[PDB]
Amino acid sequence: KPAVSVLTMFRYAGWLDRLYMLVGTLAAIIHGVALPLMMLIFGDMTDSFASVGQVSKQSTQMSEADKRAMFAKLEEEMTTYAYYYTGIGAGVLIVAYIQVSFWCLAAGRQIHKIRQKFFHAIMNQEIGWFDVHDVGELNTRLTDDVSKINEGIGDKIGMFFQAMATFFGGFIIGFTRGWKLTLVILAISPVLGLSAGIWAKILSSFTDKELHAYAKAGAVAEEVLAAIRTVIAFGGQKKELERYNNNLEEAKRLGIKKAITANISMGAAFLLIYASYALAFWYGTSLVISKEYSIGQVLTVFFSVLIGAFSVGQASPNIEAFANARGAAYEVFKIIDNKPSIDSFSKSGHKPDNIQGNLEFKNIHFSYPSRKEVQILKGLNLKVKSGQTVALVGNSGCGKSTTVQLMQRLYDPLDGMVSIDGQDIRTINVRYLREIIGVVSQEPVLFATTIAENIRYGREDVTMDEIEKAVKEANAYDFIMKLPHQFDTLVGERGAQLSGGQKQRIAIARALVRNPKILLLDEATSALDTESEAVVQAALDKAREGRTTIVIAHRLSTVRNADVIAGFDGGVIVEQGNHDELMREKGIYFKLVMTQTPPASFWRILKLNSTEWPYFVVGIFCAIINGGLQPAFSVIFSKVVGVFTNGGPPETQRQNSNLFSLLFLILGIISFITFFLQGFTFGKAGEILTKRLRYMVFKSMLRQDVSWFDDPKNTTGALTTRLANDAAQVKGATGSRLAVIFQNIANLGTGIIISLIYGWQLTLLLLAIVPIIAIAGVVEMKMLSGQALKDKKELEGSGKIATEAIENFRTVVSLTREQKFETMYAQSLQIPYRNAMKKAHVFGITFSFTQAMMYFSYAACFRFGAYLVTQQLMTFENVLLVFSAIVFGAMAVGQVSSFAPDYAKATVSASHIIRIIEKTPEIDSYSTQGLKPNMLEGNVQFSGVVFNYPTRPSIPVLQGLSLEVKKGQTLALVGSSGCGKSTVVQLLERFYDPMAGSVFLDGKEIKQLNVQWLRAQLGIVSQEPILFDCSIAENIAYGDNSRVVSYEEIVRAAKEANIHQFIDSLPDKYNTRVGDKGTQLSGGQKQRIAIARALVRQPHILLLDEATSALDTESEKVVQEALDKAREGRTCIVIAHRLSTIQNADLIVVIQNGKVKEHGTHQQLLAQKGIYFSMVSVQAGAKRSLE
Amino acid sequence: XFXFXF
Amino acid sequence: XFXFXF
């Protein structure tokens, strides 16, 4: 929203830039004025043929006499006009090039400076400024906003002024050639602007509505695909598919409605355009018959004014372009204009020599820019003698690090002063200060380049000798020399990830090259392995002894040798002294011491919509008729001016112009019928297959097994997105575009037949010209994208070094060498800059070439139309017809190139949607095959089962697992940890078939059993049961599908689950809605409902998976009571984590590494002393302990 | 050429 | 270059 003064935005343009912009906008205005002058001459041409057209037909006596004066008039006149046109061509060529080239040049030249200055400004900021701002947003802000600014100051301005020039020029010529027709053409303008408004208002409203419909279905789809395992378990797939299908059923209806309305609107708009357009022309004729206007003048003012009219609409977008650019330039310049307190790019202040390194902190109060919320340092006093080494210690708050933070003058203290030697730290130059101080940080960072270069970030001027001595003095020489490439080895986030201690040593070496008088070590030893810690500690100790040092860490192994140790409490310095003294003090220090001791292009996609043989032929026939209707608009306009030019005796004219002007409209109204049709037939055809596809996609998505849903590649969101997009995309390829293409080929076809049969070689000529300028138009767009992509690749590299610089910034400021990144960034930018120079050279040529070719083409038009054709008996009225017809065939063909990417995108999107359908699972719930045993009583046999999850075939969950459980008895399953306990329940549901081994129930192998029937006999209850949005009775009735559950039945089930307390209490009772849309319930109720749907099914096998997992207090008690009442009448497998509730179980089984380890009744496992005994003792010790 | 046919 | 804008 905030803007920028127009002058400040251009502040980086001076001398040649302003010149370029001036000559540019000049040439632009010229280019603009050029076109309406073209239409001015066009009226003078009509007058020439009109003068001869009347006289030629006025004779009806002498013939040869008309071969003399007429041909001479046409000779001189046509030659003059052709000469002029040729004149215009060179002009538009030159001015076009000048315009685009100059403006693009200016843009590039400026944006270069913008980028450099901006990055500099980013680097120049103090750390306090970073602390409050998101770096990602800032970097993206750089890359994107500078691009917006680029788009703003670019050639768009030239286009804008050019359009304004066509506007003024058009209306100037319009007015001067006459006032009436212009005012009459202005009279219609409000009517057109309103019709375009009705066009707009409908889109914004309905586009939202269209998104809303799929959001209601998408909700079903999402909750389902989120609940996939549950719906799989209970086998309610047909129901979910049904619901989704119903939602689609609604969606398509809303769709066809929108189609009808939209098509009606478009048709009406087209009708208004036709009507006004014809009307103005009729009035024109009415003015020509009065001899008030010449027949050509009418054309001139008409076209000039309409040109001038559209120029506005064509101009407007370039306003928004420049508008956005100011808004973007605001936040950009804000940082560049911002001058900090600290600078560090400044050369100022003292640079002391022979620093002894006597440091003192005096009464320092400070807070980070969280400001008044917390004040970490309340007062302070500290000294450290020259050559000494002080160690800071503290319990928490990290006020320790604050001193190291302040000693680099990253922040100025609120009150108090940090004094290096005798002088205040603020009097001495920042850079020099940072250079005389070395720093080693807990987390070291290595910029990505050779080791030498990272060591070279200590000092720009250095030799491999100093690097060697530096790393050797840090004892890092061995480890890196053993590494390949020697000093030239790579480091960074990408590639050659090394040990922390090694990176730290490299950091210490880097710091050691700095040869600092002052050394600051903050928890550099901390957060590192104990073995390498000593290795790095050796270096750290060797890094001292030439320097004064302030060290901070959690390691009290390194503190003892310190000359002074300093404790802090609540930001207040308390204890100071040698170790023995502090241990004699028995204070905080002593305390802490004691504490720490794939394309698819097919008509196969069409074979699916081949479901409808009709609805297509209708649209195509209709659209071809429309395609045959399109050139008819030309044939009239030809003969309207044609007969009027060919009129001869005037008496018969005024009667004919009324017959055409009528007909002129008649093709209009019939255009309403055909346009609405081909839009409606294609629309309705679009919404139906969208139901068929999504219904076929969703269905087959419920076919797939859990193996496919566990895939990280497929998630609910990704599936719903893949579900929406492809179906949304295929509609576009089979939709309006195709109809338009057929309409346009039909258009050009009928047009070219008429043109070709009328004009002999007049048309054959154009057909040589036109396909060339069209192809010349497409190739231009190809070079535009090529230069665009290549440019993106080059700045991607410069933006990469920028991200590296500003993400690690707090480090680079400590090492200084920001100027390094300045220079690197510049050198990185240098290549895109020279590239942007060539861009202007190219953009101008391709533009001017395509403009000149169209003006030169317009010269060859009338030149061949006149002369050779008109010297023959061939006539002007036909020429005027052929140009219209052909050039419109072309402008219609343009829509073929414009509509190209839709099919491609739809192809890529139609690729996935067939594959997703054709994919088949290992276990398909749809198969009607399988035994369906007649015997009720369940057993379960697990024998030598081996299982690895398809997602993670590394660590096996089950190896040779063997279980057995008889009917009507509970099988308790205990385990150390893992899904092994659950994998039993998962395998019995047959979500997976095990790698090796086998599992039986009635003695039949479930693998050969019917999947649905198998799953139909199971009582599964999970940890956190998901309930879909619908009546709780429908959530309970979900337990049994293929049949509607009785009320008294879900009542009985609700009674068995002890949830009846809630259900009878609610106002809506069993009709109440749950699932967070209409109501909220706690875990207890939800679980009891899960139990209800579990036992409404009347399973012979109950499966309780950690049912009490998330729960508390009495809820566990009542839910366990329910679960306990639920079993004992059925086969059961209970993996619950409360072993106090397993104490009554028919069989307990301890799982170990996939093998059953211990098994037996409680008292037997208790009689034994082993895993189960420990499992029970450890958690049994808790309940006794809670007292 | 505008949008009818010339 | 006819009457829309090209």
Given A633, A880, A883, which is nearest B4 (Cβ)? A633
B contact chains, 3+ CB pairs < 8 A: A, C
Q: Where in chain A is the domain with CATH 1.20.1560.10?
A: 1-348+598-929
Distance CA A1168, CA A1149 (A): 13
Phi/psi region, residue A486 (left: phi>0; alpha: psi -120 to 50; beta: rest), is: left
Whether A399 has a binding-site annotation, put simply, is yes
Q: Do B6 and A884 touch (CB under 8 A)?
A: yes
Contacts of A310 in chain C (CB under 8 A): 4-5
Q: What is the interface size between A and C, counted as CB pairs within 8 Å? A: 21
DSSP string, A655-704: HHHHHHHHHHHHHHHHHHHHHHHHHHHHHHHHHHHHHHHHHHHHHHHHHS
CA distance A386 to A875: 106
Dihedral sign, Cα of residue A477, residue A482, residue A487, residue A493: negative
The answer to whether residues A769 and A857 touch, using CB atoms and an 8 Å cutoff, is yes
Q: Which residues are A381's β-sheet partners?
A: A362
Q: Give DSSP secondary structure letters for A172-238.
A: HHHHHH-SHHHHHHHHHHHHHHHHHHHHHHHHHHHHHHHHHHHHHHHHHHHHHHHSHHHHHHHT-HH
Question: What value, to the nearest 5°, has the Cα angle with vertex A403 and ends A400 and A406?
Answer: 145
User: Subunits with at least 3 CB pairs below 8 A relative to chain A?
Assistant: B, C
- Side by side, the strands of the sheet bearing A381-384 are A381-384, A359-365, A415-420, A423-424
Query: Mind telling me how many Å the CA of A94 is from chain B's nearest CA?
Result: 24
The string of DSSP codes covering A240-265 is HHHHHHHHHHHHHHHHHHHHHHHHHH
Count of helix runs (H) and strand runs (E) in chain C = 0, 0
The tokens for A692 are: 């068929």
Is the separation of the CB atoms in A642 and A880 below 8 Å?
A: yes
Closest C-alpha to A437, from A920, A814, A59: A814
**Structure token pair of residue A220:** 């079903």
The span from the CA of A458 to the CA of A466, in Å, is 11
- Residue range(s) in chain A whose domain bears CATH number 3.40.50.300: 349-597, 930-1187
From CA A587, how far away is CA A1040, in angstroms rounded? 71
Cβ neighbours of A717 (radius 10 Å): 11
Contacts of A851 in chain C (CB under 8 A): 1
> Whats the size of chain C, residue-wise?
6
Whether C3 sits inside 8 A of A314 (CB atoms) is no
Burial of A1173 from C-beta contacts in 10 A (0-12 / 13-18 / 19+): middle
Distance CA A159, CA A851 (A): 13
- Which chain B residue is nearest to residue C3, measuring alpha carbons? B2
CB contact under 8 A, A274 and B2: no
C3 vs A306, A854, A855: nearest CB = A306
DSSP per-residue codes, A778-790? HHHHHHHHHHHHH
Question: If you write DSSP's letter for every residue of A424-459 in order, what string do you get?
Answer: ETTTB-HHHHHHHEEEE-SS----SSBHHHHHTTT-
| A1150 strand-pairing partners | A974, A1158
Identify the H or E element spanning A391. Answer: strand A389-394
Q: Is the dihedral of CA A40, A41, A47, A53 positive or negative?
A: negative
**String of DSSP letters for A65-93:** GGGTHHHHHHHHHHHHHHHHHHHHHHHHH
SS3 sequence of A807-865: HCHHHHHHHCCHHHHHHHHHHHHHHHHHHHHHHHHHHHHHHHHHHHHHHHHHHHHHHHH
Q: Are A504 and A471 in contact (CB under 8 A)?
A: no
A–B: how many Cβ contacts below 8 A?
27
Residue type, A90: A
Q: Which of A303, A638, A770 is nearest to C2 (CA)?
A: A303
Query: Do A971 and A963 touch, CB atoms closer than 8 A?
Result: yes
A823-839: b or e for each residue (b if 16 or more CB lie within 10 Å)?
ebbbebbeebbeebeeb
State the best of B2, B3, B6 to mutate against chain A, taking most chain A CBs within 10 Å. B6
Strands of the sheet containing A940-947, edge to edge, are A958-965, A940-947, A996-1000
Instruction: Label each residue of A798-820 as H, E or C.
Output: HHHHHHHHHHCHHHHHHHCCHHH
Which of A33, A35, A856, A884 is the best mutation test for C, with the most CBs of C within 10 A?
A35
Count of other CB atoms within 10 angstroms of residue A614: 9
In whole angstroms, what is the distance from residue A1021 CA to residue A1011 CA? 18
Judged by phi (left if over 0) then psi (alpha if -120 to 50, else beta), residue A938 lies in beta
Do the annotations mark residue A348 as ligand-binding? no
**Partner-chain contact A855 C1, CB within 8 Å:** yes
Distance CA A1179, CA A59 (A): 121
Residues 6+ apart with CB under 8 A from A601: A907
Q: Give yes or no for a contact between A257 and A248, defined as CB atoms under 8 angstroms apart.
A: no
As a whole number of Å, the CA-based R_g of chain C is 3
**Spatial distance between the Cα atoms of A590 and A883, rounded to a whole number of angstroms:** 100
Closest residue on chain B to A748 (Cα): B5
Interchain CB distance below 8 Å, B6 and A274: no
How many other C-beta atoms lie within 10 A of the C-beta of residue A868?
13
CATH fold of A1-348+598-929, please?
ABC transporter transmembrane region fold (1.20.1560)
Return the bridge partners of A350, or none.
Answer: A428
Contact (Cβ atoms closer than 8 angstroms) between residue A968 and residue A1138:
no
Q: Are strands A548-552 and A518-522 parallel, antiparallel or unpaired?
A: parallel
Is residue A513 within 8 Å of residue A467, measured between CB atoms? yes
Neighbours of A896 (CB within 10 A): 16
Query: Residue A511: which residues within 8 A CB-CB, separation 6 or more?
Result: A438, A439, A440, A458, A519, A543
Q: Is residue A266 within 8 Å of residue A608, measured between CB atoms?
A: no
- In angstroms, the separation between the Cα of residue A861 and the nearest Cα of chain B is 13
The residue in chain B having the minimum alpha-carbon distance to the alpha carbon of residue C4 is: B2
Give the DSSP letter of residue A520. Answer: E
Q: How far is CA A924 from the centre of its chain?
A: 35
How many angstroms separate the CA atoms of A168 and A30, rounded?
12
- What's the rounded Cα separation, in Å, for the pair A968 and A966? 7
Say yes or no: B6 contacts chain C, CB-CB below 8 A: yes
Query: Phi and psi for A996 in degrees, rounded to 5?
Result: -135, 165
Minimal-distance CA residue of chain A relative to C4: A307
- Per-residue tokens: A611: 């479901």
| Residues comprising chain A, all counted | 1187
Neighboring chain C residues of A306 at a CB cutoff of 8 Å: 3
Q: Token digits for A531?
A: 């073995």
Chain A hits for C4, CB-CB cut-off 8 Å, are 307, 310
Whether B4 sits inside 8 A of A891 (CB atoms) is: no
- CA dist A212 and A194 (Å) reads 28
CA distances to A17, A150, A154, A1140 from A839, in Å? 16, 13, 12, 78
- DSSP secondary structure letters along A614-642: TTTHHHHHHHHHHHHHTTHHHHHHHHHHH
CA distance C2 to chain A (A): 8
| Residue A977 among known ligand-binding residues | yes
- H/E element holding A479? helix A477-482
Return contacts of A234-242, CB within 8 angstroms, 24+ apart: A234/A1015, A234/A1038, A234/A1039, A234/A1041, A234/A1093, A234/A1097, A235/A925, A235/A1012, A235/A1015, A235/A1016, A235/A1041, A236/A1038, A236/A1041, A237/A702, A237/A925, A238/A1041, A238/A1042, A239/A1041, A240/A702, A241/A695, A241/A698, A241/A699, A241/A702
CA pair distance A969, A967, nearest whole angstrom: 6
Give the Cβ contact number of residue A299 at 10 Å: 24
Residues 6+ apart with CB under 8 A from A700: A916, A917, A919
β-bridge mates for residue A550, sequence order: A390, A520
Burial of A796: CB neighbours in 10 Å, binned 0-12, 13-18, 19+: exposed
Dihedral angle sign, alpha carbons of residues A946, A950, A954, A955: negative
CA distance A551 to A803: 31
* Residue of C1, C4, C5 with shortest CB distance to A858: C1
A934 assigned binding-site residue: no
Residue whose C-alpha is closest to residue A301's, from A47, A84, A85, A39 = A39
Contacts of B4 in chain A (CB under 8 A): 274, 277, 633-634, 637
Q: How many CB atoms lie within 10 A of CB A956?
A: 15
Determine how β-strand A572-577 pairs with β-strand A423-424.
unpaired
Kindly report the nearest CA distance between residue B2 and chain C, in angstroms.
5
Tokens 């179980």 found at: A1145
Residue B3 C-alpha, separation from nearest chain A C-alpha, in angstroms? 8
Angle at A907 between CA A902 and CA A909, to 5 degrees: 95
Least Cα separation, residue C6 to chain A (angstroms): 8
Per the CB < 8 A criterion, the answer to whether A823 and A802 are in contact is no
- Is A394 assigned to a binding site? yes
* Contact partners, residue A305, CB within 8 Å, separation at least 6: A170, A171, A174, A181, A182, A185, A186
Q: Which helix (H) or strand (E) is A643 found in, with range?
A: helix A632-645
DSSP H helices, A290-389, are 295-337
DSSP assignment letter at A1018 = B
CATH architecture of the domain formed by A930-1187: 3-Layer(aba) Sandwich (3.40)
Distance of CA A109 to the CA centre of its chain: 30
Overall fold of domain A349-597:
Rossmann fold (3.40.50)
How many other C-beta atoms can be found within 10 angstroms of the C-beta atom of residue A929?
Answer: 11
Phi, psi of A463 (to 5 degrees): -120, 155
- A1055 marked among binding-site residues: no
Residue A415, burial from CB neighbour count under 10 angstroms (0-12, 13-18, 19+): exposed
Number of Cβ atoms within 10 Å of the Cβ of A295: 23
Distance from the Cα of residue A1161 to its chain's centroid: 59
B2 touches chain C (CB under 8 A): yes
- Measured CA to CA, the distance from residue A1180 to residue A253 in angstroms comes to 63
Is A790:A835 a contact under the CB 8 Å cutoff? yes
A423-424 and A970-975 beta bridge pairing: unpaired
Rounded to 5 degrees, what angle do the CA atoms A933, A935, A940 make?
85
What is the 3-state secondary structure of A523-570? CCCCCCCHHHHHHHHHHHHHHCCCCEEEEECCCCCCCCCCCEEEEEEC
φ/ψ bin of A416: left (φ > 0), alpha (ψ from -120 to 50), beta (otherwise): left
The alpha carbon of residue A362 and the mean position of all alpha carbons in its chain are separated, in whole angstroms, by: 53
Closest residue by Cα to residue A166 from A44, A81, A39: A39
3-state secondary structure of A378: coil
The residues of C whose Cβ lies within 8 A of any Cβ of A are 1-6
Resolution stated for this PDB structure, in Å? 3.8
Phi then psi for residue A514, to 5 deg, are -65, -15
A299/A46 Cα distance (integer angstroms): 9
Q: Do A303 and B2 touch (CB under 8 A)?
A: yes
